[PDB]
Each structure stands twice: as C-alpha cells, then as structure tokens.
Amino acid sequence: GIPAKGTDDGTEITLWTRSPLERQAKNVVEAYNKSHKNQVKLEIIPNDDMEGKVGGASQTDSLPDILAGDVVRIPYWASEGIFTDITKQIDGLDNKADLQQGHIEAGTVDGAEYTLPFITDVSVMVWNKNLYKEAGLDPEQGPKSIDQFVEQAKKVAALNKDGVAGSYLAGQSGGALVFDLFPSVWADGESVMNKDGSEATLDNDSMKGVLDAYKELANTTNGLGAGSKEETGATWTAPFANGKIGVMPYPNTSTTALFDAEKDGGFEVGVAPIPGTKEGKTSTFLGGDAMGISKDSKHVAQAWNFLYWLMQSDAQKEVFADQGDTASNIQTLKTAYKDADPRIQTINSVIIDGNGQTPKSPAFNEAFNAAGSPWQLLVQNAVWGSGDLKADNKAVTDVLSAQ
Numbered sequence: 065g066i067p068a069k070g071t072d073d074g075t076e077i078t079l080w081t082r083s084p085l086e087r088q089a090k091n092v093v094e095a096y097n098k099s100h101k102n103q104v105k106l107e108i109i110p111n112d113d114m115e116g117k118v119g120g121a122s123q124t125d126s127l128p129d130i131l132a133g134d135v136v137r138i139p140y141w142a143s144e145g146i147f148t149d150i151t152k153q154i155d156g157l158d159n160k161a162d163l164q165q166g167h168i169e170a171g172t173v174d175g176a177e178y179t180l181p182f183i184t185d186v187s188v189m190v191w192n193k194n195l196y197k198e199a200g201l202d203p204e205q206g207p208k209s210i211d212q213f214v215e216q217a218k219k220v221a222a223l224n225k226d227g228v229a230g231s232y233l234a235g236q237s238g239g240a241l242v243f244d245l246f247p248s249v250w251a252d253g254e255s256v257m258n259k260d261g262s263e264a265t266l267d268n269d270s271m272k273g274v275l276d277a278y279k280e281l282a283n284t285t286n287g288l289g290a291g292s293k294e295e296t297g298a299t300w301t302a303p304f305a306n307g308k309i310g311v312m313p314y315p316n317t318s319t320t321a322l323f324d325a326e327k328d329g330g331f332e333v334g335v336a337p338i339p340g341t342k343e344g345k346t347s348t349f350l351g352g353d354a355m356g357i358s359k360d361s362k363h364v365a366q367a368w369n370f371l372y373w374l375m376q377s378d379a380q381k382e383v384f385a386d387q388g389d390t391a392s393n394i395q396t397l398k399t400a401y402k403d404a405d406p407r408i409q410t411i412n413s414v415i416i417d418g419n420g421q422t423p424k425s426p427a428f429n430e431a432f433n434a435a436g437s438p439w440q441l442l443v444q445n446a447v448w449g450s451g452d453l454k455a456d457n458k459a460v461t462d463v464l465s466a467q
C-alpha cells in the first residue's frame with residue numbers, strides 16, 4: 065500500500081458494503097478484527113442506497129478507507145476517481161492469477177487497477193425438494209433447460225396450495241433480473257452487450273426464450289409468486305427462503321441461510337447451475353462486490369493490510385470455505401472444499417468451469433440496475449405486457465452509448 069503487506073498498527077479502518085452480502089461481510093470483518101491490531105468499522109448499506117451514498121460522500125470527501133461496490137457499478141466509480149490507484153500493489157500480489165478476474169477487470173480503467181474481489185456472489189438455480197416431491201417431480205432433477213424450468217414450475221403451480229407458486233421473478237429489480245436472466249443467454253453462447261459495453265444485444269433467440277418462459281408462468285395460475293410484479297429487490301430471496309416457491313434463480317450468498325434452515329428441520333434445497341435454452345448448457349453471473357481504497361483514505365497502508373490479507377488462500381478458507389461460502393480465490397475453490405456439502409462444491413464448479421461472465425460498462429447502472437431502467441421495462445413489457453424486444457433493446461443501447 066506503501067509496505068508489501070501493509071501496516072497493522074491498531075488503526076480503525078472504515079469499510080462500506082451492501083445488505084445482500086451482509087452474512088459474508090460479517091464473517092470477513094469478524095475474522096480480520098480477531099487476528100489484527102487494526103480494526104475494521106463495518107457499515108452495511110441497502111443495495112439501492114450505495115450509488116447516492118458513494119456520490120454524496122465523494123463530494124464531501126468522506127468516502128470510507130475501503131469501499132466495496134457491486135462489480136457492475138465499479139467501472140463507473142473507478143472512471144470517476146472514487147478509488148486510489150493501487151496498480152503496483154495489485155501487480156505485486158504473488159497469487160494475482162488465482163483472484164476472481166471479473167472483479168479486477170471491473171476496476172481496470174486506462175492501465176490503472178483500482179479493485180480486488182471482496183465477496184463473490186454468483187447466480188444459481190435453487191428448488192424446494194419438499195414441493196417437488198409433493199408435485200410428483202424427481203426431487204434431485206434440477207432443470208437442464210429453460211423448457212424444463214417452466215415444466216417443473218408449472219407442476220409446483222398445479223399443487224394449488226395457499227401462497228405456493230412455481231417460480232418468482234424480481235419484476236422491479238433490474239439488478240436481480242440481470243443476475244437471474246443473463247446466465248441463460250451466456251449458457252447458449254449468446255451475448256447481452258457488445259465487447260465495449262456501449263450496445264445491448266438482447267434481441268436474441270435465447271433472451272426471447274427466457275422472457276417467453278417467464279411470460280408462460282405469468283399466464284399460469286400460481287405460476288409466479290405474488291409480489292413478482294412489484295418486487296423492488298429488497299425482498300426477492302424471501303419467498304423461496306419461506307418455502308413458498310418451487311424453483312428459481314438465486315444468489316449463492318443466500319444459500320448458506322437455506323442449508324442452515326434445512327439443518328434446523330426446514331425444507332430440503334436442490335441447487336444446480338442456471339441452464340440455457342439449450343439442453344445441458346449452463347452459466348452464471350460472476351457478481352458480488354469488488355473493493356478498493358477510496359480517494360479519501362488517510363490510512364492507505366492499513367487499508368492495504370486488509371486487501372492483502374483477504375487475497376491469501378488462508379483467509380479465504382477461514383472467512384469463506386469454513387463458513388460454507390464461495391471464495392474469491394480459485395486455488396481456495398479447488399483445495400478448501402473437498403469435504404464441503406456437495407451443493408457448495410456444485411456451486412464452486414460454476415466458477416471453476418469458467419462459463420460465467422461479469423458484464424462491464426461505465427453505463428451499467430443507468431441501463432440495467434436503476435429503478436425503471438430500459439432493461440427493467442424490457443423485461444416487464446415481455447413478461448406481463450406486450451413486448452417490443454427490438455425497440456426495448458435499442459432503448460438499452462441508447463443509454464449504454466448516450467453516453
């Protein structure tokens with residue numbers, strides 16, 4: 065940071081991250097604070113509050129020592145000078161090639177590198193094995209295609225049980241919707257953006273299949289749980305956690321809660337990679353938060369001590385693997401989970417297999433995550449409305465390129 069492994073001298077370091085990653089953030093900070101003189105003062109911020117909080121703090125130069133941001137948000141923040149240039153420190157890491165590359169790439173602008181992985185968050189398919197058995201489905205057969213996803217959701221919908229639906233769609237969360245829907249497109253070998261991130265390529269047969277799948281469930285009695293049309297992103301993981309949804313895309317960072325509920329006598333959870341339109345094709349969204357040292361830090365060496373510590377396979381095993389969470393370190397993924405719950409090892413295989421993507425655009429929030437983004441309207445038109453996929457896609461590109 066200035067020293068190789070930074071300075072551990074009893075400095076209080078501030079770290080900001082977001083509510084969806086709260087369980088993993090707690091584990092990381094608890095472990096750091098138990099093993100260092102330095103202490104991290106953790107703030108966990110609601111997902112939708114980070115843009116305005118970071119923007120406001122940038123203007124009053126009160127950004128924290130360590131800022132973690134959604135990997136889709138980082139390219140913009142890094143372009144605005146939110147982060148201190150740590151190119152030489154990242155480039156000195158012996159194990160740089162083991163670190164989740166999408167998170168480093170998110171923070172790469174003009175040869176400068178600003179970020180490392182903080183918490184990996186990947187999208188997977190989860191299903192309720194109890195509802196599957198009740199519906200006459202094989203409880204171990206996750207969907208291998210978007211068609212099979214529809215069939216399984218429809219059999220759970222046909223149970224006609226109070227508050228039970230086949231699937232659930234985060235209708236008003238552009239962010240949840242990229243996370244949940246992009247992988248089906250990538251699984252098929254299609255793209256959602258051009259290489260620059262300046263154009264949307266969403267008007268494709270795989271995206272149309274995915275939207276038509278959710279349209280079918282929208283037009284099925286009990287197809288999509290109540291709340292799907294209004295879901296802001298604040299509650300989208302709750303209906304499945306509550307045992308009310310047959311099958312849906314889901315964050316790996318929320319699965320440990322499900323595995324725990326199951327150990328405590330709750331319903332049994334299936335996990336599989338998100339499938340393509342094409343039988344047996346799979347992908348994921350290589351998301352989560354990357355972290356950098358803010359432009360406002362007066363403890364760069366102490367912040368670097370945290371950044372350095374977390375990249376090590378030791379810390380990655382302690383804070384991720386030993387807590388049943390997916391690590392940001394591929395060497396940790398390949399070595400530290402040999403006796404983990406098979407569903408954890410299945411989740412890790414969607415990183416190791418290499419079929420996932422991290423979308424990179426300076427305009428990503430404005431085009432995708434933002435409330436009433438062109439992407440949110442595109443999905444809404446296609447699922448609950450009349451879609452014009454060509455027109456809606458061009459609305460996304462007009463934000464991506466303008467400017």
Ligand SMILES: OC[C@@H]1O[C@H](O[C@@H]2[C@@H](O)[C@H](CO)O[C@@H]2O)[C@H](O)[C@H]1O
Pocket residue numbers: 084111134135136185237238239240242243297298315349350351352353433
């Ligand atoms: O934001 C894009 C990726 O999706 C996941 O985050 C989601 C939020 O956008 C949504 C609103 O909270 O909750 C989801 O967990 C990944 O963490 C992001 O990289």
